[PDB]
Design a protein around this ligand. Structure first.
Ligand SMILES: [Mg+2]
Ligand SMILES: [Mg+2]
Ligand SMILES: [Mg+2]
Ligand SMILES: [Mg+2]
Ligand SMILES: [Mg+2]
Ligand SMILES: [Mg+2]
Ligand SMILES: [Mg+2]
Ligand SMILES: [Mg+2]
Ligand SMILES: [Mg+2]
Ligand SMILES: [Mg+2]
Ligand SMILES: [Mg+2]
Ligand SMILES: [Mg+2]
Ligand SMILES: [Mg+2]
Ligand SMILES: [Mg+2]
Ligand SMILES: [Mg+2]
Lengths: 210, 203, 102, 38, 48, 80
RNA sequence: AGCGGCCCCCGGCGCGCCGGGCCCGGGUCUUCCCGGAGUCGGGUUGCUUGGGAAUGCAGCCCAAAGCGGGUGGUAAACUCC
RNA sequence: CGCGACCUCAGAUCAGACGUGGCGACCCGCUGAAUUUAAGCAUAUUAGUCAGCGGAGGAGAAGAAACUAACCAGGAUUCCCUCAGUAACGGCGAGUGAACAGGGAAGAGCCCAGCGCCGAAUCCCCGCCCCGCGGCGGGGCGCGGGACAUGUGGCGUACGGA
């Protein structure tokens, strides 16, 4: 039974909502369990970074997040090859791989390539056993710095550009932005039907010629 | 090799050859019992393709099962209730005959655990399937690293729970714009978190 | 002049340069190798043809094309599969005429 | 019938075998040995 | 009415050829078990 | 998705060094203002704006907004 | 209360000593596979779904192909992606 | 007219293993309502819910695309926030009702068959010697039995590759 000028509402309580309620009373213990697990893992993997392997750069899909950049899941097998790395040992260095990916550009590829090459510069690989065969670092650096990193590795951050001031020429003052947009929508809308009436016009031009 | 030539053959289930054979075997099996053991397969390639290796510890049974739908089991019709639910005849059970057959064999043979199955015959009122079974405690299977996954206490009675190829179909599992239930793992679990209210502390 | 990068029309999009390489020829599935072809045409002479496609080859000798397609479409399903099939069965009759009339 | 269940359950009578299983789990189902002599 | 592709497994040989055929192939039989052990013994013994 | 903005609330995307160092040194400075950086796509002509020859970059424009800018002695630029 | 003490057992983490296994990598040419059937798929029916000229599931009928097959949220044909 | 075989098929207090029943808060699969709301009621809602029958573990299930998308593109599954009381369904009436993208917890990928090469290069049981024996294993010698060519093991599975 309604009354003077309120809202109309539709609440979703006509079921038995009451056997199935959920309390967030275990919120802190859930936090506490994780730390002791998150610490202990990093103690298990002693010098290795706690966050995990390295992850790549990846742009976000849609028109809304068209512009931003984030961290992905795996380097592709194309871009590894360019670095000269095998898809089997990389998992052991700390490198991530997903082979479901593609590449439909070149400027994406060169960036993640240049990321990998800095990585192996800043890497440190211990020898298995005291002998020092190929790709085994010197004891000097191997003792000084052998410690974990805190947080992610080579973090992703969105850079911007700075187009400096410049003088406005006349080629720009005499540009008609709005009208060009309106023309553009139109041509994309009538691109097909024009040709079809034109083709039919030309397919009767033969009748005019015959 | 040869298992290919055989394969394209069985894809032609209407030539004079296969019409002959199947008509002949259904005669035969129809005379035997409802459940009996077979010594060896009738579709060897298919069985190899599901995971039948030819060693001792693997088994083949054959099964008969009657066709049709499901009559609502009650007295003389007369379901006591709404007009929507006066339905007794044009009703269609929610699992396939193939998975039904696996179930009988699992219940009759309790130690033996069930791998998968396939089709070999058809008739007006019967339909015949073969079923592939395993003995877990035979040492040939215990000592082989690549098939002792099933000697764990967890892969009991797969047929009773929907975990073969023929059981996984009826549940409805997939990834796309077509399923959207079973996002959790199953229909119940989706129903829960959607019809479950979450009351935080602070709000 | 002074064309800018529009965001709409026939030619839109933040412009880039493409890379070109081998494709994932996982996309090369369902293609016809010679050894596999030797199989299917061998089994064809051994087992033979089915009754509906047999019924159809009558209509095609008498050049009743339209009815052939509709029969097959009822008896199979989709328009496409029918169109492909009708052309196969015609080629079958071609070798027949080619082989016999000499 | 909740009541009808709870009058005959696993926890109602003697449990003359489970009572020790609980005591044996607490050490690891050891067997075949003794403590140190004296 | 038995079709031919099955029927051709009833047009078979007679006595006089099958004996010649079996009598021949009895010379080209595979390696018997423990005829194989002897073979290996003698074979890897040839390293001296 | 098309977040909108007017002209009055445009010089606030940039700091105060910019707007003051313009109208100064008399080179034809005419700074550059990206809206897609600060989370906006289309430009709208609600208000007015003070006399400096600014440049703007945005995906879309409106008719009156394009006018006011050229009226003050600036320009408009499109991007993808 | 205490980076307090004494005793007993069970842990695991690593260095020694024989046994047996394994002789097991990566850059330029010719062949291979194009791969899993009463199954996809299509009709008609019944239950279900937000899924609407049929989301999903099952019965009965018909029943495939191999530069093919599926998807591309309005039925159908013709074509490009 | 005795032996080899399987179409095959029964028997034994034969030697050696196994399954059944119980609890059932959390989990998986089937089956499955009426009160009630609509100020009446028959579709709808209550509800894929109570009751009912099965089957388990310390978690279970799902799971490494016959995907999402239309972007300068992402990239197994699972839980949280949000998208959202929205798009859509509906005696278009009472009423119902999701997904993607974005940010986080955690993060790990891999085997077969079929094509194809390798003197079946492979497995089980009894016998004897030696270590080890209370989660019955290892090493060696038996012209000792058996399964297997109606296909056992090594190389190798679309990450496109081999
Ligand atoms: Mg009020
Ligand atoms: Mg179907
Ligand atoms: Mg409903
Ligand atoms: Mg039980
Ligand atoms: Mg009422
Ligand atoms: Mg009332
Ligand atoms: Mg009433
Ligand atoms: Mg009703
Ligand atoms: Mg309902
Ligand atoms: Mg219940
Ligand atoms: Mg599991
Ligand atoms: Mg809102
Ligand atoms: Mg509902
Ligand atoms: Mg998401
Ligand atoms: Mg994290």
């Amino acid at each position: 039974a309604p009354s003077r000028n309120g809202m109309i509402l539709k609440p979703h309580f006509h079921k038995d909502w009451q056997r199935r309620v959920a309390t967030w009373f275990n919120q802190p213990a859930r936090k506490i369990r994780r730390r002791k697990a998150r610490q202990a893992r990093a103690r298990r993997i002693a010098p290795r970074p706690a966050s995990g392997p390295l992850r790549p750069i990846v742009r976000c899909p849609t028109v809304r997040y068209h512009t931003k950049v984030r961290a992905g899941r795996g380097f592709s097998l194309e871009e590894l090859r360019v670095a000269g790395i095998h898809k089997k040992v990389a998992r052991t260095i700390g490198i991530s791989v997903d082979p479901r990916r593609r590449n439909k550009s070149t400027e994406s590829l060169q960036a993640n390539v240049q990321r990998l090459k800095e990585y192996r510069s800043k890497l440190v690989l211990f020898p298995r056993k005291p002998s020092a065969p190929k790709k085994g670092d010197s004891s000097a650096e191997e003792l000084k710095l052998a410690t974990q990193l805190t947080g992610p590795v080579m973090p992703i951050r969105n850079v911007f550009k700075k187009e400096k001031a410049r003088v406005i020429t006349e080629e720009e003052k005499n540009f008609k932005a709005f009208a060009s947009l309106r023309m553009a929508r139109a041509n994309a809308r009538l691109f097909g039907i024009r040709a079809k009436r034109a083709k039919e016009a030309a397919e009767q031009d033969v009748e005019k010629k015959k | 090799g040869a298992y290919k030539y055989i394969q394209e053959l069985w894809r032609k289930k209407q030539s004079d050859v296969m019409r002959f054979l199947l008509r002949v075997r259904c005669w035969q099996y129809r005379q035997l019992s409802a459940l009996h053991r077979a010594p060896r397969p009738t579709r060897p390639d298919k069985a190899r393709r599901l995971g039948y290796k030819a060693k001792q510890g693997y088994v083949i049974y054959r099964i008969r099962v009657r066709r049709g739908g499901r009559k609502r089991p009650v007295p003389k019709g007369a379901t006591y209730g709404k007009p929507v639910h006066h339905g007794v005849n044009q009703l269609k059970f929610a699992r396939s005959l193939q998975s039904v057959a696996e179930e009988r064999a699992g219940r009759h043979c309790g130690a033996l655990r069930v791998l998968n199955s396939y089709w070999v015959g058809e008739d007006s009122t019967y339909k015949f399937f073969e079923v592939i079974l395993i003995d877990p405690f035979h040492k040939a299977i215990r000592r082989n690293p690549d098939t002792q996954w099933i000697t764990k206490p967890v892969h009991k009675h797969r047929e009773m729970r929907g975990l073969t190829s023929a059981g996984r179909k009826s549940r409805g599992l997939g990834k796309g714009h077509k399923f959207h239930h079973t996002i959790g793992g199953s229909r119940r679990a989706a129903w829960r978190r959607r019809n479950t209210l979450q009351l935080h502390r602070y709000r | 002049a002074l064309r800018y990068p529009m965001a709409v029309g026939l030619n839109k999009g933040h412009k880039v340069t493409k890379n070109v390489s081998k494709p994932r020829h996982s996309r090369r599935r369902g293609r016809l190798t010679k050894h596999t072809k030797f199989v299917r045409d061998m089994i064809r002479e051994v087992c033979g043809f089915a009754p509906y496609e047999r019924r159809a080859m009558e209509l095609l000798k008498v050049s009743k094309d339209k009815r052939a397609l509709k029969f097959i479409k009822k008896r199979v399903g989709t328009h496409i599969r029918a169109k492909r099939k009708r052309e196969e069965l015609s080629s079958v009759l071609a070798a027949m005429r080619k082989a016999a009339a000499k | 019938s909740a009541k009808a269940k709870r009058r005959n359950t696993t926890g109602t009578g003697r449990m003359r075998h489970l009572k020790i299983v609980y005591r044996r789990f607490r050490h690891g189902f050891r067997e075949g040995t003794t403590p140190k002599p004296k | 009415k038995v079709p031919p592709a099955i029927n051709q497994f009833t047009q078979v040989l007679d006595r006089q050829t099958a004996t010649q055929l079996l009598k021949l192939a009895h010379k080209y039989r595979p390696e018997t078990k423990q005829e194989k052990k002897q073979r290996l013994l003698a074979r890897a013994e040839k390293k001296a | 998705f098309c977040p909108t903005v007017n002209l009055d609330k445009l010089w606030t995307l940039v700091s105060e060094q910019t707007r003051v160092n313009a109208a100064k040194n008399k080179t034809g400075a005419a700074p550059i203002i990206d809206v897609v950086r600060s989370g906006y796509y289309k430009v709208l002509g609600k208000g007015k704006l003070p006399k400096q020859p600014v440049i703007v970059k945005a995906k879309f424009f409106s008719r009156r907004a394009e006018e006011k800018i050229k009226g003050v002695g600036g320009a408009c630029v499109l991007v993808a």
